[model samples]
Target chain A: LDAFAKVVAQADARGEFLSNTQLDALSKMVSEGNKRLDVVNRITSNASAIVTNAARALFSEQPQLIQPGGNAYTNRRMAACLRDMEIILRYVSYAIIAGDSSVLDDRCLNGLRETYQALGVPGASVAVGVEKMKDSAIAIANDPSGITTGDCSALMAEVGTYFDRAATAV
Target chain B: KTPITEAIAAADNQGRFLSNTELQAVNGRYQRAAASLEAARSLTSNAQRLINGAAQAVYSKFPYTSQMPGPQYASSAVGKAKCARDIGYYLRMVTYCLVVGGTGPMDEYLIAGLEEINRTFDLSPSWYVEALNYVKSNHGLSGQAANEANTYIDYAINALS
Candidate 1:
């Protein structure tokens, strides 16, 4: 909202010609964008929390994997993958909230899936879900005219699906 | 000689020692683990420095506020988490070193790694301080360092959030 307001203010100062129709569209886009960000923020935060809790539980249960001097190679690998997932989720949440989608790319999504599968948690679904959400986001960002409250709301629901998979697995 | 290598050497001379080939392999393992520990330590040190500089930047600007507004500052916070990522890397590498090398000569690396992580997030040094004392007394935390690093790294990352 503040961003939209500042943009309008700048346009006002420059006397850039913009129809009220365009302004209304801009307003709608910002509103929809905020909703999208809110949904993603919530989903990612939940995912991170789930992973953190799961990793802790797993570590406690099988302390040998990471118990300093105990050797459990495969166990250590799974633990590292899970821990890495948590870190990735944290970075993605912060990056999205900060409005930089560059970090939340295909590479990150793939890494999450790789780790999830490594942990023996079936997660191809999450990759699909995230890809869908990313596609929607790109579509919206590239063309605000095509954006709608319904469109983003649907995307949010789908993102929740992605979150749900990890939540259950973790 | 490094303390860990010296300890390994001492063990080699004792009756509870390995054959020539086994000794060579064990020494090789210890050397690699030590190298890994050194690498991991460097990463965490750099991360700690970056995170502190970021925290100071945040404090200087806000002075007093819960909300860290603006995209630039948001990016800084993400950068702080990137430090957290470096921390994750360091801790994992330390875990590998500890597991591969086992309890004896790995003690120095284990102690140093824990101390470094402790320095990264030290609000309540009570746990770290006590743990350090315990390790110091025992000369090693052979079966405990990996989990400790995992738990502490989790705390450190979440604290930033």
Candidate 2:
């Protein structure tokens, strides 16, 4: 959405005209971005389904491990990472739908979670999101900031909801 | 120098004391197996080093597919699956290393290939038959490699999946 927004912002500044397709695509990007964000938001609103799906999928398969050293370290590490990532992604999805990060402020750590409706990281999905509106990825990429606990509770909740909806829609 | 005992003197307990004739018999069998494996692998024009090389004739993003994705990165599931296609190339890639050992990139490609397929456990032993059926259902996979890959993939998937 940033790219479209930038173009719109730039064009508006210069009084440029846009074609119907261009306008349509831009609007589409905005809508999809909003939906994506909405999905994220909805997760925070209702996270049971996503948490369930992720958990189910994680436990769904146990392929034989062919480790060079046959240690469980790789599986353990990846599972831990997935667990954390799934949580924050939920909120990022929520922010995408809401198009508002103001709500993300939360008691993210040590019970700061309920403090806000959205979680904000520097340029992350809370406001701009990772796959920003579809055209902007920097919102998430511009992160070493990653996701925080607030993001986990909110963003992941959102991701779960959005994906559930999207998957069904597809 | 001509004494056979001289060579045997250095042999360990695990090493067999072989007459020249016996050595020839062992070497001969190894040579034939190597040849068969080579023939089986080389029968295709689109041989890959990873699993699902079959998926690549249709999908271009696969690394070994003549041209491949760049270093920038592809983040989607389909994109990651493309990595799996490259990894399929890797399955084929490793054989090259095992068959023709060198210091160059073939091993690296093989490693990447193995990582991709192994990531999904897509190459179990039983699906080899299913691959054959999948091919039997196709018109293009006609030759020996087709039969071979189909056989391998089918049984492999069945056993593995």
Candidate 3:
């Protein structure tokens, strides 16, 4: 994400507006980063597979995932966790494109924090801390050009950190 | 790589915030470009001295009035060759000036850069067109570099017009 942000931030002193080519490039980076993150969510949220691994640990002999209730429990919570995470990802993309920190405000981020806690994802506080969110917000609001290259880059980096915590907690 | 080009390449990838260290690197590049330009100008000045010396040698031999030296001193191959060689060096300076001039407004340097090229070579569009072609081929300048060079040639032509 920081790598993606670097693409946009380098333009700060050189010129004011992003030329069309630059806009297109930023768009591509955001799209590609989103794809990588989507895969991460899919891989981490497979609760059935995680349970199967646990079952083997429980029984030294080849154990099967015999708890249907556990399967149901995992499925339901994963759905809620992923739903909010998806929202966070979507808004992050929007914030980057428009170069506006307001696109990613306290409300959405607090909700993001709530969702992570719902699943007891570790490092939730780090991902949604007031100071970190505020810093990211400044990076967004400081730019006069909506979502200049620098703004997107900074936002992308933050989003990446958020996703990592989500994946790790899963 | 020069700092400016390096910074430009970095910007091509990332578009966001810069560390003070990163900003200073690119600023360093700007200074490098200025130094290079000054060195190029010095080369032109040195070429000028050589050209003047060759002209004086021919002039001293004939002491010809504008009407008198028609074909006499003109036949001196040694003088003529020296003049042509020195002129070639001077024209390289013209190329450098043209390369640098069009970035700013129509200042004295821009006007002089245009005029000298025209007065020395005549206003055949082919002359500058050829210089641009040379710039492109010999220097391996393409894309933005070549496009920027084309603007200088355009400025030279507009001055002639």
Number of the predicted model whose lDDT against the real structure is largest = 1
Candidate 1 residue lDDT tens string, B1-161:
34345555777778565456556766776665654454445435544453344444444444432244432222356434433443334344434444444432233333334432333222233422332232223222233343444333334333333
Task: For residues A1-170, write the lDDT of model 3, one tens digit per residue.
Answer: 24445455766666556779878877776665533333232222222222233233332332221234321136664354334444544444454444443445543554555554575543332233222333333333343431213323444465455444333333
DockQ of each: 0.04, 0.02, 0.01
**Superposed Cα deviation of residue B3, candidate 2 (Å):** 27
lDDT of 2 by residue, B103-156 (tens): 123323332233333333323222222322333344244444344334434433
Model 1 regions more than 4 Å off: A1-30, A39-51, A60-83, A91-105, A111-156, A164-170, B1-125, B131-161
Question: Per-residue error at B61 for model 3, in Å?
Answer: 33
- Regarding DockQ, does 1 or 3 come out ahead? 1
Candidate 1 residue lDDT tens string, A1-170: 23355466778899987779878867675666766575554545356334444444444455554433443223234444454555545544544443433344443544655566576543543333334334443333334353342445454444444434433433
| B1-161: candidate 3 lDDT, tens digit per residue | 33444565576668755656678876654544554455444434555443445344434543541223322222366545544453354346444644343223334434556656545643333333333334333433343333333344344433433
Tens digit per residue, CA lDDT, model 2, A50-113? 4333433332332122122221113333343234334444534433554433233231122322
lDDT of 1 at A52: 41
RMSD per candidate (Å) reads 17.1, 20.3, 26.0
Please report how far candidate 1 places residue B127 from its true position, in Å. 3.7
lDDT of 2 at B25: 52
Report the number of backbone clashes for model 2.
69
